[PDB]
Amino acid sequence: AVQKRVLKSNPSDLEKEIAQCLLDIELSSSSDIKTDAKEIKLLSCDLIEVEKLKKKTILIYIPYKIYTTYVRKIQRKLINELEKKTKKYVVLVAKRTILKGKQKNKSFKIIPRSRTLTSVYDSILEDIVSPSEIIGKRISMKADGKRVFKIMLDSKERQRDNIEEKLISFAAVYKKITRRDAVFSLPP
RNA sequence: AUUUCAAAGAAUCAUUCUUUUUAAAAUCCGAUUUUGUUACUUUGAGUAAAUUAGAGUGUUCAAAGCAAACAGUUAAAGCAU
């Protein structure tokens, strides 16, 4: 039934807890979850704990097609309901193929731009911020050659109370995904 | 303009050189090893001597040359029994 329906990965408790929360929204029939949670499929989940230690954050991988068609459409409303159920800070991202064309893979006349490492990381950066929208990107090159990605977000979600912990969370998630340093900001 | 960023360790003087690992496809016993072409570059292979650079070597020195050196008044010694 429900665990097998939701979870792509083999049976696991915390993944099952997210599935349970989505099911809890689906059973109850909350007002603004449009056409239910019910076609959401969980690929896998990871748990990340930030240095500043304000709760813990869950990253959720979703199959690309489900994520674009279902998750992206409703995403702010869906995340807030899931956040309300969930005891920890959740972010949903699309799983994406990464490969190099010098390996000369079987089904490819040239690797698509969508499957390029840089494009994938930019696309994932879009996915994590998603309820808020990127104004601009800037890469600061430290004297010792360390590189810091300064990401400016919108002015709409600036006036939320949860901002800096969320910015820390975005920075944390992107670092866990790829070991670049981030900084995030909101307009003066 | 454009397409795979990096990370951590070990060696070593705050420096430096290095190793490990981070998608995908094919293969071999869940682990193990392969993946455009050319220019460019690295090593190599094979490559007349004389000349040339250059080592060894006091031709009376040097230009040269390719020789020489050692000990023995004819034995010490080495090796054949």
The structure's method of determination equals cryo-EM
Query: 């991202």: which residue's tokens?
Result: A93
Q: Is A125 exposed, middle or buried (0-12, 13-18, 19+ CB in 10 A)?
A: buried
Give the β-pairing of A57-63 and A89-95: parallel
Count the Cβ atoms, other than its own, within 10 Å of residue A62: 22
- Identity of residue A111: I
Q: What is the largest CA-CA distance in chain A?
A: 56
C1' of nucleotide B6: residue with nearest CA? A179
As a rounded value in angstroms, the CA-to-C1' distance for A74 and B68 is 100
**Which nucleotides on strand B sit less than 7 A from a protein beta carbon?**
2-7, 23-26, 35-36
Q: Residue A110 carries which DSSP code?
A: S
Residue A151 contacts residue A124 (beta carbons within 8 Å): no
Which nucleotide lies at the shortest CA–C1' distance from A106? B25
Contact of A59 with A91, CB cutoff 8 Å: yes
